[PDB]
Design an enzyme around this catalytic site. Structure first.
Site, PDB file in Angstrom:
ATOM      1  N   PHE A 163       0.829  -1.206   0.000  1.00 31.90           N
ATOM      2  CA  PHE A 163       0.000   0.000   0.000  1.00 31.90           C
ATOM      3  C   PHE A 163       0.865   1.258   0.000  1.00 31.90           C
ATOM      4  O   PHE A 163       0.510   2.277   0.583  1.00 31.90           O
ATOM      5  CB  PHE A 163      -1.033  -0.060   1.132  1.00 31.90           C
ATOM      6  CG  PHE A 163      -1.985  -1.175   0.944  1.00 31.90           C
ATOM      7  CD1 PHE A 163      -3.082  -1.026   0.105  1.00 31.90           C
ATOM      8  CD2 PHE A 163      -1.748  -2.416   1.506  1.00 31.90           C
ATOM      9  CE1 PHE A 163      -3.929  -2.096  -0.162  1.00 31.90           C
ATOM     10  CE2 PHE A 163      -2.622  -3.474   1.252  1.00 31.90           C
ATOM     11  CZ  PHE A 163      -3.684  -3.312   0.397  1.00 31.90           C
ATOM     12  N   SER A 164       1.986   1.186  -0.708  1.00 29.99           N
ATOM     13  CA  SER A 164       2.905   2.313  -0.808  1.00 29.99           C
ATOM     14  C   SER A 164       2.301   3.460  -1.621  1.00 29.99           C
ATOM     15  O   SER A 164       1.529   3.233  -2.545  1.00 29.99           O
ATOM     16  CB  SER A 164       4.186   1.846  -1.482  1.00 29.99           C
ATOM     17  OG  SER A 164       5.145   2.878  -1.564  1.00 29.99           O
TER      18      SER A 164
ATOM     19  N   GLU B 114      -0.593  -1.628   4.997  1.00 33.96           N
ATOM     20  CA  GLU B 114      -1.904  -1.876   5.596  1.00 33.96           C
ATOM     21  C   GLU B 114      -3.044  -1.166   4.865  1.00 33.96           C
ATOM     22  O   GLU B 114      -2.983   0.040   4.633  1.00 33.96           O
ATOM     23  CB  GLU B 114      -1.887  -1.430   7.050  1.00 33.96           C
ATOM     24  CG  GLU B 114      -3.114  -1.818   7.795  1.00 33.96           C
ATOM     25  CD  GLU B 114      -3.013  -1.557   9.285  1.00 33.96           C
ATOM     26  OE1 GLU B 114      -1.897  -1.201   9.762  1.00 33.96           O
ATOM     27  OE2 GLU B 114      -4.056  -1.677   9.964  1.00 33.96           O
TER      28      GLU B 114
ATOM     29  N   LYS C  29      -1.330  -8.134  12.096  1.00 35.35           N
ATOM     30  CA  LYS C  29      -0.615  -8.390  13.361  1.00 35.35           C
ATOM     31  C   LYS C  29       0.387  -9.538  13.233  1.00 35.35           C
ATOM     32  O   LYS C  29       1.615  -9.318  13.276  1.00 35.35           O
ATOM     33  CB  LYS C  29      -1.603  -8.658  14.509  1.00 35.35           C
TER      34      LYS C  29
END
Length: 399
Positions: A205-206, A222, A238
């Protein structure tokens, strides 16, 4: 039909040319980069490069984030909208305030209707909007170190940690994501800095983003929230540690509440709890929370009711957001906010702005934070060290 331009280099090589070239010519740029995480559950980010604008809005009042979002969506139905919303947009969801100064001059939120929307593929550029074939062709043929200040001392961290543990021991919360800020002053070349960050730590998710003089350089792993047809998903991340398993369940369950407020009754579920995924640079445990959108709710309602992320606040959410605001040393501003898009079919995807560097070229300000989950199982020494280790990659790239 859409137009497709074949590439004669790798997509990486094209983008290494494209971002600086665009930096010099446009004031609104959003680049979403999945970094070849092709096995990511429900997919990584779409590989989009959007730039220029026919409409752009910079919001300074954090109580007006969703008001503005709704207004622009009404004006631009069946259109692309690229969006940044700061964590302080919480003040647009609940009766909340932000009591401390921010660490960087930055919008509460921004919106733009891009002029050009490209989807970057391994072998070429698929043009969704704009008549920019000739720009692809133009691109085809086209530095001091910075000391980073730790704002919160170890003594101050332990004091805050103890305050949070007392809140937990009193039964006023059971999980709180406590973050500490880092600031610097200097000049950087943002696209070049994004390239260094992304090469060192490529994540699904860059983002590279430019809006006026405000930049987001993100190595986020994320997803906050996505809409695909009628299906909504959110994916907290997690490790068979009892501490981690328990924490993950607390957070997944909070995210269920957030999706439930805009879901068809009975449609909230967890298709995968802590699923193991192996990628080239990392293995990850990912939970997927899913709902079906209530037809009486808009796509913006879904995001609003889920904002800010459960994974970055805690339980009970509203009081914990008050505790966070009181106990943290600075306003989070863009940290723990989101960048993403809404498309012409009313689909959307949005990340979590962690593992990021925020920069404003006008003020020569740099800002970043890192945090961790505080529960009854947390120990101050360990969580302090974890915060420092989590920020270290970003400080490393700036030097």
């Amino acid at each position: 039909s859409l137009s497709f331009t074949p590439l004669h280099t790798t997509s990486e090589a094209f983008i290494e040319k494209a971002l600086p070239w665009l930096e010099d010519r446009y004031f609104h740029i959003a680049y979403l980069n999945p970094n070849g995480y092709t096995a990511y559950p429900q997919g990584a980010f779409r590989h989009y490069l959007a730039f220029g604008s026919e409409a752009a809005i910079h919001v300074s009042d954090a109580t007006r984030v969703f008001e503005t979002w709704n207004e622009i969506k009404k004006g631009y139905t069946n259109e692309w909208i690229f969006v940044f919303a700061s964590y302080d947009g919480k003040n647009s969801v609940e009766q909340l305030h932000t009591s401390k100064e921010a660490g960087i001059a930055f919008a509460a939120a921004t919106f733009f209707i891009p002029e050009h929307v490209w989807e970057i593929q391994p072998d070429g550029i698929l043009i969704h909007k704009g008549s920019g074939s000739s720009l692809v062709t133009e691109i085809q043929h086209a530095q001091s170190d910075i000391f980073v200040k730790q704002v919160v001392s170890k003594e101050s961290y332990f004091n805050a940690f103890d305050e949070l543990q007392q809140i937990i021991a009193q039964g006023d919360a059971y999980e709180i994501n406590y973050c500490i800020p880092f600031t610097a002053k200097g000049n950087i070349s943002p696209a070049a800095t994004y390239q260094r960050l992304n090469k060192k730590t490529p994540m699904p998710f860059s983002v590279y983003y430019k809006f006026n003089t405000e930049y987001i350089l993100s190595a986020s792993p994320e997803r906050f929230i996505k809409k695909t047809g009628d299906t909504i998903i959110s994916q907290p991340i997690k490790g068979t540690s009892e501490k981690e398993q328990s924490e993950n369940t607390m957070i997944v369950d909070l995210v269920r509440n957030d999706l439930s407020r805009t879901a068809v009754a009975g449609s909230v579920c967890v298709p995968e709890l802590s699923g193991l995924y192996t990628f080239p640079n990392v293995h990850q445990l990912i939970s997927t929370v899913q709902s079906t959108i209530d037809p009486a709710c808009s796509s913006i309602d879904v995001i609003q009711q889920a904002f800010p992320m459960g994974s970055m606040t805690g339980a009970p959410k509203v009081n914990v957001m008050k505790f966070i605001d009181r106990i943290e040393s600075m306003a989070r501003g863009p940290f723990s906010g989101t960048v993403g898009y809404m498309d012409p079919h009313d689909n959307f995807d949005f990340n979590v702005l962690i593992r990021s560097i925020f920069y404003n070229s006008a003020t020569q300000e740099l800002f970043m934070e890192a945090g961790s989950a505080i529960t009854s199982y947390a120990k101050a020494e360990t969580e302090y060290e974890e915060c420092l280790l989590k920020i270290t990659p970003m400080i490393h790239i700036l030097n």
